[PDB]
Amino acid sequence: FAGLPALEKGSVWLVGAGPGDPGLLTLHAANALRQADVIVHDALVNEDCLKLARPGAVLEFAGKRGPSPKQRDISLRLVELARAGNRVLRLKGGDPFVFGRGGEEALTLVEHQVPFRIVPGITAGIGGLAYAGIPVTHREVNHAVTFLTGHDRINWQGIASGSPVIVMYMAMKHIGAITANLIAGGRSPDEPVAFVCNAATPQQAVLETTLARAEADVAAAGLEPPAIVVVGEVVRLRAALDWIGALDGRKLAADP
Amino acid sequence: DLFAGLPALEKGSVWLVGAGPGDPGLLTLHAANALRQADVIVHDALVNEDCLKLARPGAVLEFAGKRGGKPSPKQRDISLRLVELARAGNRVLRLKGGDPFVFGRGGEEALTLVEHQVPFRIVPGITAGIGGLAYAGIPVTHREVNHAVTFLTGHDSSGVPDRINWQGIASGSPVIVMYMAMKHIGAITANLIAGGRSPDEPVAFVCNAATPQQAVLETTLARAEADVAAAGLEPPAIVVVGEVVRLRAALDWIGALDGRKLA
Ligand SMILES: Nc1ncnc2c1ncn2[C@@H]1O[C@H](CSCC[C@H](N)C(=O)O)[C@@H](O)[C@H]1O
Numbered sequence: 073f074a075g076l077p078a079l080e081k082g083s084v085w086l087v088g089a090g091p092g093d094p095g096l097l098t099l100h101a102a103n104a105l106r107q108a109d110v111i112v113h114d115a116l117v118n119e120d121c122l123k124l125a126r127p128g129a130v131l132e133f134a135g136k137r138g139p140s141p142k143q144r145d146i147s148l149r150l151v152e153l154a155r156a157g158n159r160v161l162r163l164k165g166g167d168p169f170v171f172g173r174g175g176e177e178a179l180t181l182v183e184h185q186v187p188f189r190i191v192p193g194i195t196a197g198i199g200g201l202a203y204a205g206i207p208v209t210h211r212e213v214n215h216a217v218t219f220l221t222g223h224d225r226i227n228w229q230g231i232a233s234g235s236p237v238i239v240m241y242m243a244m245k246h247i248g249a250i251t252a253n254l255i256a257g258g259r260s261p262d263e264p265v266a267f268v269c270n271a272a273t274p275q276q277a278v279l280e281t282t283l284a285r286a287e288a289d290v291a292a293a294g295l296e297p298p299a300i301v302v303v304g305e306v307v308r309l310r311a312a313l314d315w316i317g318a319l320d321g322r323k324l325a326a327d328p
Numbered sequence: 329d330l331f332a333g334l335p336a337l338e339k340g341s342v343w344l345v346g347a348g349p350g351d352p353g354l355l356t357l358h359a360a361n362a363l364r365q366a367d368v369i370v371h372d373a374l375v376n377e378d379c380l381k382l383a384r385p386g387a388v389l390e391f392a393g394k395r396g397g398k399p400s401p402k403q404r405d406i407s408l409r410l411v412e413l414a415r416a417g418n419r420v421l422r423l424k425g426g427d428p429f430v431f432g433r434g435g436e437e438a439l440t441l442v443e444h445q446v447p448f449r450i451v452p453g454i455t456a457g458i459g460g461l462a463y464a465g466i467p468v469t470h471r472e473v474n475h476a477v478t479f480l481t482g483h484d485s486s487g488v489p490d491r492i493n494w495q496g497i498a499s500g501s502p503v504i505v506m507y508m509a510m511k512h513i514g515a516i517t518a519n520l521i522a523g524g525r526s527p528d529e530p531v532a533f534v535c536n537a538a539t540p541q542q543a544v545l546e547t548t549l550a551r552a553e554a555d556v557a558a559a560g561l562e563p564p565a566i567v568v569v570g571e572v573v574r575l576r577a578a579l580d581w582i583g584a585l586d587g588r589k590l591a
């Protein structure tokens with residue numbers, strides 16, 4: 073059960089690995105993983121999906137090695153590999169277009185007449201949250217959701233007003249500033265907030281707190297990247313929708 | 329060779345599973361695994377044969393949605409039926425379009441499941457607003473364009489008042505991604521313009537993202553309402569507002585039916 077497009081040559085697929093749990097891979101991803109000659113991957117939350125790679129052909133780490141590689145180089149590696157006839161698979165955490173420089177990579181690709189495909193992935197801000205029992209939207213609660221990165225140019229007031237649920241990528245180092253920005257924008261100090269670290273991995277960990285207390289709580293809990301930060305009433309649903317908790321003993325409750 | 333340390337879909341439980349936007353390749357391993365195990369697959373109209381072909385033979389396929397003309401089952405009816413299937417000992421798959429938790433009443437369903445003591449799992453899927461737009465060459469995020477994205481429903485934005493604070497939504501993110509915004513595009517688009525958005529800001533409509541029927545219209549906020557009508561376009565569509573729409577000319581990879589090539 074796979075009659076789907078082949079990973080060709082002079083070509084690169086920018087492929088979403090999801091937040092960690094393999095099997096949150098798309099069938100397109102699994103297939104690409106099966107046929108790539110070379111895989112240029114990130115900081116992977118699960119190094120598990122790489123077990124799918126075809127009879128050992130080159131793995132290529134592209135994250136921090138110790139210094140860094142600037143995107144420019146990573147992108148230009150893809151083209152180098154592609155022009156030399158490899159089936160190239162650029163393997164990205166989560167979804168390639170949700171804060172993952174994927175648009176940059178693809179722009180470079182066309183800029184050098186390299187054909188590409190994009191394979192969407194599960195992003196930590198939606199699927200990861202799901203593994204914590206927190207939906208990004210729920211009828212009674214929100215008709216909008218904003219997804220943002222911590223480093224701004226970011227209209228903090230417009231987000232504060234306007235966005236009943238807020239979902240934050242790379243906001244650990246700045247959590248103190250950000251929550252203070254929301255509170256001053258008219259958000260309640262007591263508004264529920266949740267941190268989810270290593271969403272959808274066996275190392276998953278959750279902090280339930282509050283806009284006013286968030287900075288003290290995550291210092292105290294000793295929490296660390298990678299983490300999605302979510303703000304808003306939907307946090308209250310975790311007590312009721314934590315299906316992972318339910319697998320061990322958890323007694324799931326009713327909404328408010 | 330394998331995919332076989334994956335969790336079984338157990339007798340008497342319900343999985344809420346995202347089918348993604350259309351393309352069967354966008355199913356997750358977990359979803360494909362559910363499909364192959366299910367005794368009964370309760371699915372959306374916003375579904376798509378190809379997925380369903382993975383069901384074992386003698387699985388039953390139940391259309392949860394609206395048949396005839398408009399005489400709807402309310403959400404509660406669909407949820408109770410899931411409970412009835414599960415209590416009878418079926419392995420139950422509720423197959424939802426896209427992702428179960430993105431404007432798809434998955435929370436409500438799960439909540440109903442909990443109330444009636446039925447265990448469940450959630451299986452994320454690709455959402456039309458991220459993966460769908462990818463198939464049209466529009467990234468939802470791009471560091472030269474935006475550090476924030478807002479997703480919304482236009483569902484109840486007829487113009488009986490409702491509380492989206494359209495001005496906050498206008499200032500909050502350079503990119504806006506809108507679900508169920510076709511029928512009320514005129515009012516929504518005027519909300520955004522009253523909110524400070526430029527009448528000329530680029531807008532794209534993506535209908536049936538990630539299917540052989542995909543169709544895209546670029547336009548602007550002022551012209552959006554007239555244009556979409558003249559183009560004859562229909563739900564399901566995602567409407568994206570902002571500069572990322574300009575990247576489709578350079579990133580339209582599905583436009584590998586033909587060169588004409590990327591800026
Ligand atoms: N498993 C995980 N759990 C929690 N947050 C995660 C995560 N994986 C990635 N992230 C978030 O994503 C940031 C990396 S930026 C890459 C985002 C990725 N393309 C995606 O769609 O998910 C991290 O700082 C963290 O905030």
Ligand SMILES: Nc1ncnc2c1ncn2[C@@H]1O[C@H](CSCC[C@H](N)C(=O)O)[C@@H](O)[C@H]1O
Pocket residue numbers: 349350374424425426427428429430431432454455456457460506507508509534535536537538563564565566
């Ligand atoms: N294939 C597709 N192409 C374009 N828009 C789609 C789509 N599938 C779903 N949608 C959008 O989704 C709305 C239904 S509500 C379902 C949303 C789903 N949970 C998801 O994550 O995508 C539609 O009215 C339309 O705005």
